[PDB]
Amino acid sequence: GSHMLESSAEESLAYREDDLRGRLGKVITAVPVDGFGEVVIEGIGGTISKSAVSFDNQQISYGTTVLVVDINNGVLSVTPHEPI
Structure with a gap:
């Protein structure tokens, strides 16, 4: 069952990455x-x-x-907000 635990950890990391959707970034x-x-x-x-x-x-x-x-998954979609 280790492959399902690894899949659950990868899906948890995808959720941790989707939390970054509420933040700014830098190209x-x-x-x-x-x-x-x-x-x-x-x-x-x-x-x-x-x-x-x-x-x-x-x-x-x-x-x-x-x-x-x-x-x-590792491919963010972005647009230049350029805030103050």
């Missing part, structure tokens, strides 16, 4: 209007980078602040 590899890049949550001293896609069909260069508006 470090460009995300064009129909493409893929990379992001980190704004807690940069205690968080991990993930792949990212442009939820609002926007071009999202390096070094901008984004809202993680939807989430899939």
Whole structure:
């Protein structure tokens, strides 16, 4: 039954990642209007980078602040909120 316990741990990690949907992030590899890049949550001293896609069909260069508006397994969906 160990494979079901491993599946339960992976589904729990997917739920921990879906909790990040309520937070801002920061793009470090460009995300064009129909493409893929990379992001980190704004807690940069205690968080991990993930792949990212442009939820609002926007071009999202390096070094901008984004809202993680939807989430899939290691593939976050983001848009440039750029808050104050």
